[PDB]
Amino acid sequence: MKPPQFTWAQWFETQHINMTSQQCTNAMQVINNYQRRCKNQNTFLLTTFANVVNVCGNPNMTCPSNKTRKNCHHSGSQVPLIHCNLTTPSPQNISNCRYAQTPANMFYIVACDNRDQRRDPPQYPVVPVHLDRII
């Protein structure tokens, strides 16, 4: 779920780029405090926002998660990543939700769209809006 103060691009950056600690339990507190629930699984890509914007310039392909959508783009190269998995729920005290961490080196597929006219910076006309698949 996206909180209202974020554009889709800003929420993508928060969930998948800005890993605020190398430890999943700490990093996940940010996502979970914003969306008011402990997310069951989440991938952080060890790459830059600018690098993902450049992936939006690669050829269009069908999104693995939706046969009807053609706004997806393959990374071309692999990147390091960290996958976080919920081990310990706590729906009445989100702070005490714990995670495992799994490091890997994989390709990724992102969905991209035109930026939010009012709120996204003009610097980037085309932005990532969803992490569709890791492969």
Taking the C-alpha atoms of residue 132 and residue 134, their distance in angstroms, rounded to an integer, is: 7
Active site residue 73: no
Largest CA distance in the chain: 44
User: What stretch of H or E contains 37?
Assistant: none
Examine the residue annotation and report whether 83 is marked as an active-site residue of this protein.
Answer: no
Strand partners, 102: 83
* Alpha-carbon gap, residue 90 to 57, rounded angstroms: 40
Q: What is the dihedral of CA 121, 122, 123, 128, to 10 degrees?
A: 70
- The beta-carbon contacts of 75-79 under 8 Å, at least 24 apart in sequence, are 75/107, 75/108, 75/109, 75/110, 76/107, 77/107, 78/105, 78/106, 78/107, 79/45, 79/46, 79/47, 79/105, 79/106, 79/108
Fold entry, domain 1-135: P-30 Protein (3.10.130)
Is 70 labeled as ligand-binding?
A: no
CA–CA distance, 124 with 92 (Å, rounded to integer): 39
Report whether 41 belongs to an annotated binding site.
yes
* 11: nearest Cα among 135, 130, 134, 116: 130
Cα 47 to Cα 29: distance, rounded to the nearest angstrom? 21
88 is in an annotated binding site: no
Q: What values do phi and psi take at 95, rounded to 5?
A: -60, -20
10 is in an annotated binding site: no
Beta bridge partners of 80: 105
Instruction: Tell me the technique behind this structure.
Output: X-ray
Contacts of 49 (CB under 8 A, 6+ apart): 13, 17
Dihedral angle of Cα 48, 53, 59, 60, to the nearest 10 degrees = 110
**Residues with Cβ < 8 Å from 92, sequence gap 6 or more?**
none
- Helix residue ranges per DSSP H, the chain: 8-16, 24-35, 49-55
Q: Give the whole-angstrom CA distance, residue 100 versus residue 24.
A: 7
Q: What is the stated resolution of the deposited model, in angstroms?
A: 1.0
